PDB file of C-alpha atoms in Angstrom:
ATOM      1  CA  UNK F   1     165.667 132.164 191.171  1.00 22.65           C
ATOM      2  CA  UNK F   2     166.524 128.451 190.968  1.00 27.17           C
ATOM      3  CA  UNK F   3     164.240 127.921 187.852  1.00 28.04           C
ATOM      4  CA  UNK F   4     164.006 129.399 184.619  1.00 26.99           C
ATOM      5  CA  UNK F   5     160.647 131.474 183.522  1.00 28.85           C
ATOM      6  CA  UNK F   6     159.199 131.092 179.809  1.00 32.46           C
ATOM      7  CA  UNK F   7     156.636 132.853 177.875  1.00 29.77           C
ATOM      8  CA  UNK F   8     153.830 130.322 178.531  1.00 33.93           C
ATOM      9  CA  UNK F   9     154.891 129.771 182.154  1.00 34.10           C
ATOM     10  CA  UNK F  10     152.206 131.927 183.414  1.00 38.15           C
ATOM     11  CA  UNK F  11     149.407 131.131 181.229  1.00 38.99           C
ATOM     12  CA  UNK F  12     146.627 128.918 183.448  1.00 38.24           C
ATOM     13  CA  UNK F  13     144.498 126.433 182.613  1.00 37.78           C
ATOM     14  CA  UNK F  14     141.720 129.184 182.606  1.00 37.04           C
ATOM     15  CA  UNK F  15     143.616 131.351 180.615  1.00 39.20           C
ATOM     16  CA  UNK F  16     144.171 128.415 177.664  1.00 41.50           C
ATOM     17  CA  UNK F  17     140.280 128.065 177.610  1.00 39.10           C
ATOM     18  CA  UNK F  18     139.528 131.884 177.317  1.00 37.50           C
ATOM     19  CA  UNK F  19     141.824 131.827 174.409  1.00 36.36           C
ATOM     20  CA  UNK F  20     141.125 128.926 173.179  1.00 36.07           C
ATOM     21  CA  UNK F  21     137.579 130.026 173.212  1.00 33.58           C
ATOM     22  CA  UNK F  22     138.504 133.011 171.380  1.00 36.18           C
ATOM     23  CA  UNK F  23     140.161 131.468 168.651  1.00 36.31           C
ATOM     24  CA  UNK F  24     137.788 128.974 168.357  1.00 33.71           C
ATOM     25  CA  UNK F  25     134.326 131.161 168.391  1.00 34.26           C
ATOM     26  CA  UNK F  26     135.805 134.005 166.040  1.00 31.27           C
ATOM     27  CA  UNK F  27     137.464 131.249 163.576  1.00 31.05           C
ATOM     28  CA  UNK F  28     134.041 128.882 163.692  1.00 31.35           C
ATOM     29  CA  UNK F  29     132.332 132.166 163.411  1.00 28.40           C
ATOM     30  CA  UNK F  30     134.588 133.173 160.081  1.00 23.81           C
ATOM     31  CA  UNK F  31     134.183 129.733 158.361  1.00 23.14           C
ATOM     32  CA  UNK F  32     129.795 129.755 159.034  1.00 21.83           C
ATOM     33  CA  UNK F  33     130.306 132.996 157.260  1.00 24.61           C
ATOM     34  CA  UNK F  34     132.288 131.648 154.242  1.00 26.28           C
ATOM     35  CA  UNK F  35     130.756 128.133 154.472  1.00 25.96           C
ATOM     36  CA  UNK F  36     127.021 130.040 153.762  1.00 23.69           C
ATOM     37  CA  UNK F  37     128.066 131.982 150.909  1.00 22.06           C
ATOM     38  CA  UNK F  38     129.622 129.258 148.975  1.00 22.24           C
ATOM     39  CA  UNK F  39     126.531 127.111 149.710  1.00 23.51           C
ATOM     40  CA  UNK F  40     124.087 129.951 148.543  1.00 23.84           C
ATOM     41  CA  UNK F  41     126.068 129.973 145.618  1.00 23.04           C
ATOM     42  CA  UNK F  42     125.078 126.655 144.837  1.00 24.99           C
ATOM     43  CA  UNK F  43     121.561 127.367 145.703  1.00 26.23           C
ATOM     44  CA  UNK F  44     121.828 130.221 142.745  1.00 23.05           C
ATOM     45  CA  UNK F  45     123.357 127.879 140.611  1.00 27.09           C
ATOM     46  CA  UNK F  46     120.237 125.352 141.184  1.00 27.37           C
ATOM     47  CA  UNK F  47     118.350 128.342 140.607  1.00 28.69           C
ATOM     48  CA  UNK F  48     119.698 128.449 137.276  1.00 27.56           C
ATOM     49  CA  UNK F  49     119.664 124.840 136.472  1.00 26.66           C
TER      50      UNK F  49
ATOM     51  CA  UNK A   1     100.747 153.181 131.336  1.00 26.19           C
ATOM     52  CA  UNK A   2     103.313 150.877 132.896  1.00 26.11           C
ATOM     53  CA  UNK A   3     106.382 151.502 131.093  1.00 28.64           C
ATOM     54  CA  UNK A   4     108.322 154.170 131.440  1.00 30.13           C
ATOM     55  CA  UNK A   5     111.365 155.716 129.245  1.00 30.47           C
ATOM     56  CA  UNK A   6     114.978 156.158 130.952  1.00 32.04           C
ATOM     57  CA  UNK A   7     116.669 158.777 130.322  1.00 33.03           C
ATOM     58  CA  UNK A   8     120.062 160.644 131.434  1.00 33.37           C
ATOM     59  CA  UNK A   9     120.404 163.668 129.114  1.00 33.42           C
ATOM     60  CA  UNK A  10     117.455 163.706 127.094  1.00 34.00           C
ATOM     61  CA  UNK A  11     118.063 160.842 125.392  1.00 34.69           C
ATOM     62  CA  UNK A  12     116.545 156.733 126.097  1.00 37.88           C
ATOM     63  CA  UNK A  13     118.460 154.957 127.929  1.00 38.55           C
ATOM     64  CA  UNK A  14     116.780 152.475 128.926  1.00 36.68           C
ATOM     65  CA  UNK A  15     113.233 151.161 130.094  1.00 36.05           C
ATOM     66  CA  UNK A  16     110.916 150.438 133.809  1.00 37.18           C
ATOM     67  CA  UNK A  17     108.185 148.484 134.338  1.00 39.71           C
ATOM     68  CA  UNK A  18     106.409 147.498 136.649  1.00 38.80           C
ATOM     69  CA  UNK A  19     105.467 144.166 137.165  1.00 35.51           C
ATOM     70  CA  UNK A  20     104.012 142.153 140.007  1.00 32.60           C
ATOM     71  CA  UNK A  21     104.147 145.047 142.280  1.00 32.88           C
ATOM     72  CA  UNK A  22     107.599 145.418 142.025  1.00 35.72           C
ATOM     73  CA  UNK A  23     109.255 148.228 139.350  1.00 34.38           C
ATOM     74  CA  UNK A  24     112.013 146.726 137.440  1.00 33.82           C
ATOM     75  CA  UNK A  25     115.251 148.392 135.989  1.00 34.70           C
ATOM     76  CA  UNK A  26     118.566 147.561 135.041  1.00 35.43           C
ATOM     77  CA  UNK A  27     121.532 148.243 137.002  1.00 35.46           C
ATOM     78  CA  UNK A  28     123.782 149.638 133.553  1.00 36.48           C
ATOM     79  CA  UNK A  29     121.160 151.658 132.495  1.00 39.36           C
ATOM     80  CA  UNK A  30     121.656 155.457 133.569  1.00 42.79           C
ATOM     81  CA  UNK A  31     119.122 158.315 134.195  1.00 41.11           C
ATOM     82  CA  UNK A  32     115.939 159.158 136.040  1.00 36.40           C
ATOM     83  CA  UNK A  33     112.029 157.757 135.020  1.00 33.45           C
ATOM     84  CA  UNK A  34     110.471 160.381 133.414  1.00 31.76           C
ATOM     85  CA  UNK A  35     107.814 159.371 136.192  1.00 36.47           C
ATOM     86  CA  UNK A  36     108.340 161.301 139.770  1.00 36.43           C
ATOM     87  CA  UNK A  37     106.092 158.863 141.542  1.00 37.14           C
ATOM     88  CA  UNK A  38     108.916 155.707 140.141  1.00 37.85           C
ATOM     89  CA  UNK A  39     112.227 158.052 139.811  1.00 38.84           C
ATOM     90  CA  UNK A  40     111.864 159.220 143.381  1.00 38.37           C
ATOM     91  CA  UNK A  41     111.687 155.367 145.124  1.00 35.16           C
ATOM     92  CA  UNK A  42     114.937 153.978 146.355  1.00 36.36           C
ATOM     93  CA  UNK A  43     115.920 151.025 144.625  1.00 35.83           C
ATOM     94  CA  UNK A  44     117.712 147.799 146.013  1.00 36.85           C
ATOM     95  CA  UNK A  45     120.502 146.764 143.878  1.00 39.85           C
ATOM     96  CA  UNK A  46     119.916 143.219 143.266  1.00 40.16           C
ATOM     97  CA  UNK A  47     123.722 142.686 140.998  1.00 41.95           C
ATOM     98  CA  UNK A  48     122.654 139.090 141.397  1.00 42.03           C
ATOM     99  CA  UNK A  49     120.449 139.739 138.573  1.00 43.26           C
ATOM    100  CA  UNK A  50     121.617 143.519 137.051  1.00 42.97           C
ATOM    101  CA  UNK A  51     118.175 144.535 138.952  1.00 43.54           C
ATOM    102  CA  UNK A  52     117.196 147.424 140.759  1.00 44.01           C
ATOM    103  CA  UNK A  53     113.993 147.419 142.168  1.00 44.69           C
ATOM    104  CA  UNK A  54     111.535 149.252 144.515  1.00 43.63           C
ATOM    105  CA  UNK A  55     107.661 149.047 145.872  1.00 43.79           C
ATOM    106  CA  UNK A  56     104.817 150.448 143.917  1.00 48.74           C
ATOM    107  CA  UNK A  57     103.653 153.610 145.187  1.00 51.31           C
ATOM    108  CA  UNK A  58     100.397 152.927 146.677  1.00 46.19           C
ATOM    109  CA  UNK A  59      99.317 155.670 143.937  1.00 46.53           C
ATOM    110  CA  UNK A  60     100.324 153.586 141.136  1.00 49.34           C
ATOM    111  CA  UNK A  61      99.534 150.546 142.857  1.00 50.26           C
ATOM    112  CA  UNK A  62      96.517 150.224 140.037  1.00 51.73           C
ATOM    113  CA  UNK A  63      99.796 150.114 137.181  1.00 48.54           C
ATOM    114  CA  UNK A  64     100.862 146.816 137.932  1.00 50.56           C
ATOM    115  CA  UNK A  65     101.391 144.360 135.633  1.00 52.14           C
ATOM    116  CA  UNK A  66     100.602 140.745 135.827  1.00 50.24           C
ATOM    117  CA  UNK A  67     103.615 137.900 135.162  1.00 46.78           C
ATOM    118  CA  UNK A  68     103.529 134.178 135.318  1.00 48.58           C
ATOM    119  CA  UNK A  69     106.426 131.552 135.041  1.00 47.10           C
ATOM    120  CA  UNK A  70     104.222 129.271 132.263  1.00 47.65           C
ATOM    121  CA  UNK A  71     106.335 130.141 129.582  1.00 43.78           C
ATOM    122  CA  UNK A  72     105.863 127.137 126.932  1.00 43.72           C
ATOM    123  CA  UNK A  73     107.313 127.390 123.589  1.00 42.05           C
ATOM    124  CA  UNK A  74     105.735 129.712 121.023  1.00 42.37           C
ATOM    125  CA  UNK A  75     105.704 133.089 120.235  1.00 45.54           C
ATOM    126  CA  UNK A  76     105.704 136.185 122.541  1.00 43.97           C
ATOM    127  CA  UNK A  77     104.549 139.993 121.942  1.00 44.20           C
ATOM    128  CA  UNK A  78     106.945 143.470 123.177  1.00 43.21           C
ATOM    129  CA  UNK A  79     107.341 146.296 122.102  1.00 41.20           C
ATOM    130  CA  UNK A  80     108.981 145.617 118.737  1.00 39.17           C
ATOM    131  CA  UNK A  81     106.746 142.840 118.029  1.00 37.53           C
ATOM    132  CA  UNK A  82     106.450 139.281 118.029  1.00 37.94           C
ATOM    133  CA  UNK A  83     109.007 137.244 120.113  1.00 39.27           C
ATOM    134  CA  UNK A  84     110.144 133.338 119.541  1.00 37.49           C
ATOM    135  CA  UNK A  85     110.856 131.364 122.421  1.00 37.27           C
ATOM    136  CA  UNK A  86     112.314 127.709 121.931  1.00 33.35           C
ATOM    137  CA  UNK A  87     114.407 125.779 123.616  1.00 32.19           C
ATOM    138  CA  UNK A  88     114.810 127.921 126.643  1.00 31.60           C
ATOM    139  CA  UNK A  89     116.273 130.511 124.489  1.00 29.48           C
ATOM    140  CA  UNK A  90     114.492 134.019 123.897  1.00 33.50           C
ATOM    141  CA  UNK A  91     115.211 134.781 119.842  1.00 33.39           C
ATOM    142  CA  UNK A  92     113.974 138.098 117.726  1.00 33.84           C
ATOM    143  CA  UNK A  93     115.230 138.596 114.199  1.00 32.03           C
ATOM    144  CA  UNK A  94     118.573 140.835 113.304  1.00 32.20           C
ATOM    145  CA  UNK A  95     117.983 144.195 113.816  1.00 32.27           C
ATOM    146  CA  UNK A  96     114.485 144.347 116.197  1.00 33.50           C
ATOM    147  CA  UNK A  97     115.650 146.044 118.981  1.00 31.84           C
ATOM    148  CA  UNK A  98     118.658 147.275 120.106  1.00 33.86           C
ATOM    149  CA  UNK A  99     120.945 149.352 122.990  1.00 31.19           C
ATOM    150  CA  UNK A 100     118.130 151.318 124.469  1.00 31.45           C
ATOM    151  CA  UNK A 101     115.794 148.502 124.818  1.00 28.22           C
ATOM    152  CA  UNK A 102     116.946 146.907 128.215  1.00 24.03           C
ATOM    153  CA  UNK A 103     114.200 146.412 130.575  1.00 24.49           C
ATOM    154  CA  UNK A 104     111.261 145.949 128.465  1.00 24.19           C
ATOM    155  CA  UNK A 105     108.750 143.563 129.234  1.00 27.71           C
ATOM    156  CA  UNK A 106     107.981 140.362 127.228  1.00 27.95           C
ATOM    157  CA  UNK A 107     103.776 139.476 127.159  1.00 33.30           C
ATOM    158  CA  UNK A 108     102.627 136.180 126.482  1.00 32.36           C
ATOM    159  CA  UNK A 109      98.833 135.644 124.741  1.00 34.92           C
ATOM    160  CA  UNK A 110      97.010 136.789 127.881  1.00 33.44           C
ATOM    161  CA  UNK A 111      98.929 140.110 128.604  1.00 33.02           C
ATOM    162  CA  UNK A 112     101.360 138.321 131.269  1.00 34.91           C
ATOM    163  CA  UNK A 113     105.249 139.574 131.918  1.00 37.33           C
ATOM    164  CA  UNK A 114     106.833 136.325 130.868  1.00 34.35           C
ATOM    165  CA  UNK A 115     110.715 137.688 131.081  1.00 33.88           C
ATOM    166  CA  UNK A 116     112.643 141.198 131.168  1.00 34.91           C
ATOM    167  CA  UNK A 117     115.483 142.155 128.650  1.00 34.54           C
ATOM    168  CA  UNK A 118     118.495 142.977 129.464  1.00 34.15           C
ATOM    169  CA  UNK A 119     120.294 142.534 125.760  1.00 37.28           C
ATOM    170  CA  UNK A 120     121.423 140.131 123.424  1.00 34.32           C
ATOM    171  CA  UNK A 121     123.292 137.931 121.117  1.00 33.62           C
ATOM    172  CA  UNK A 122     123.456 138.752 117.467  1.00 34.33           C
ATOM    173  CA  UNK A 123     123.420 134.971 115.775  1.00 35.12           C
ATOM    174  CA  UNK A 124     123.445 135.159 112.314  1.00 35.48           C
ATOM    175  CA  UNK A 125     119.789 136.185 111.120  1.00 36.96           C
ATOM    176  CA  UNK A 126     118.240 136.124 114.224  1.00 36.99           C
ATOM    177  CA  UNK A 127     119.173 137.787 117.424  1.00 35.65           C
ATOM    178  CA  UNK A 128     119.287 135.977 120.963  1.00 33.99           C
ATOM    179  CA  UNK A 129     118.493 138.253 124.001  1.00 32.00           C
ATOM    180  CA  UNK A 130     119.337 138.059 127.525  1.00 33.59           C
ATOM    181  CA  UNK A 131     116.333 137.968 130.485  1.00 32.31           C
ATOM    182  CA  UNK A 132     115.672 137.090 133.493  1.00 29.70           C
ATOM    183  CA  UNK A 133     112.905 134.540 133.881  1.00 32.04           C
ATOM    184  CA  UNK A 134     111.334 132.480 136.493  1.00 32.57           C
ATOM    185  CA  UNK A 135     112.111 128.846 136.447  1.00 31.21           C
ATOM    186  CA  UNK A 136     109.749 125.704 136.114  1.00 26.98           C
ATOM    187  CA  UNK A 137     109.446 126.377 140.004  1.00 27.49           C
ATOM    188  CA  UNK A 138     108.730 130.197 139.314  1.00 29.60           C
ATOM    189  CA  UNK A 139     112.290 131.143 140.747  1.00 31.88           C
ATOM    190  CA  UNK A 140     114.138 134.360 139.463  1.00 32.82           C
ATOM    191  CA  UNK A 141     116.914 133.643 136.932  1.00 32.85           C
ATOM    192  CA  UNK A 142     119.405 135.111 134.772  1.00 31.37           C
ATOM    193  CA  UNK A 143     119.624 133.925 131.553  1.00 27.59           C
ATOM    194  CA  UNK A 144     122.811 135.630 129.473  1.00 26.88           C
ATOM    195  CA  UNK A 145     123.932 134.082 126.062  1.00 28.14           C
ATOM    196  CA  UNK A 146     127.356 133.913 125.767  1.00 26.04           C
ATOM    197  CA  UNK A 147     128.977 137.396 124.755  1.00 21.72           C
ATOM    198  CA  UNK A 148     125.381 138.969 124.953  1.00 20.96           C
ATOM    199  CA  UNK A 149     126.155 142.955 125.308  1.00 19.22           C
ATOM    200  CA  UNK A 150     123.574 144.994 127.687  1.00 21.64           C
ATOM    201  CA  UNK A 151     120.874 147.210 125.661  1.00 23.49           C
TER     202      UNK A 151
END
C-alpha cells in the first residue's frame, strides 16, 4: 500500500451521524433527566415558601 | 374511630389517621395498626415528606376525616389538648406530648385536620413541633424546626 491507514479512516459520513446520534440522544436524554429533578426541586422549595 | 395506635412489640410507637381519604403515617415510626383493614394496605413511601400513605378501604371509607388548608392564627385542639399556632409556627407547652406522638392529627374549631405531627423543638417553656401542612394554595409541606427530633 502506497498510503497509510488510521483509526478513523474508515468511519463514513453515515457512520459519524449514527454516532453522533448516539451520543447526542443518550447525553440530551441524561441531562432532561437531571435538568427535571433539579427543577422539581425548586418547585418543592416554592412549595415550601 | 379514626386514629389508630402503632405499635411494634406491644408498645406505642406511633399514630394513623386517616384523613381526606388518604391514611397517614410516618416513615420512622415502626410496627403494624392495631387495625387489619389499615395494617394490611400497602403504603407509598412519600420520604419527601416522612409519609407513608395508602387508600381507604372502601369499608372504612365512612372513617375519614375532613382537613382544610385555612389555618389562621389561634388555637388548635389534639389529643393532648389545646394547640397555639402563630406565626407559621405550631407551639404546645414543655412537656405535652412526646416520642410516641408522631402522626396525630391537629383539629381546628370545626373538627378539620389542620396539620400532622411528626415531632418537635423543645424552646424554653414551650415546645415547637414539626408538621406537615398545606400552604396558602393548599399544597403539602414540611415544616421541621431546626433540630426538631421525630416523636
Amino acid at each position: 500500500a502506497q498510503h497509510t491507514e488510521s483509526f478513523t479512516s474508515a468511519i463514513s459520513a453515515t457512520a459519524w451521524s449514527w454516532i453522533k446520534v448516539l451520543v447526542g440522544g443518550t447525553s440530551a436524554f441524561i441531562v432532561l433527566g437531571l435538568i427535571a429533578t433539579a427543577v422539581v426541586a425548586l418547585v418543592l422549595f416554592f412549595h415550601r415558601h | 374511630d379514626k386514629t389508630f395506635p402503632i405499635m411494634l412489640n406491644g408498645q406505642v410507637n406511633g399514630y394513623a389517621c386517616v384523613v381526606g381519604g388518604r391514611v397517614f403515617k410516618p416513615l420512622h415510626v415502626e410496627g403494624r395498626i392495631d387495625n387489619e383493614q389499615l395494617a394490611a394496605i400497602k403504603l407509598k413511601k412519600a420520604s419527601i415528606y416522612d409519609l407513608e400513605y395508602g387508600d381507604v378501604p372502601q369499608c372504612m371509607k365512612s372513617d375519614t376525616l375532613q382537613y382544610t388548608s385555612d389555618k389562621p392564627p389561634g388555637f388548635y385542639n389534639w389529643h393532648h389538648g389545646a394547640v397555639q399556632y402563630e406565626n407559621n409556627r405550631f407551639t404546645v407547652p414543655r412537656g405535652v406530648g412526646g416520642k410516641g406522638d408522631s402522626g396525630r392529627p391537629i383539629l381546628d374549631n370545626k373538627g378539620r385536620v389542620v396539620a400532622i405531627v411528626l415531632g418537635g423543638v423543645n424552646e424554653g417553656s414551650r415546645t415547637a413541633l414539626s408538621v406537615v401542612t398545606w400552604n396558602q394554595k393548599g399544597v403539602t409541606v414540611k415544616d421541621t424546626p431546626e433540630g426538631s427530633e421525630p416523636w
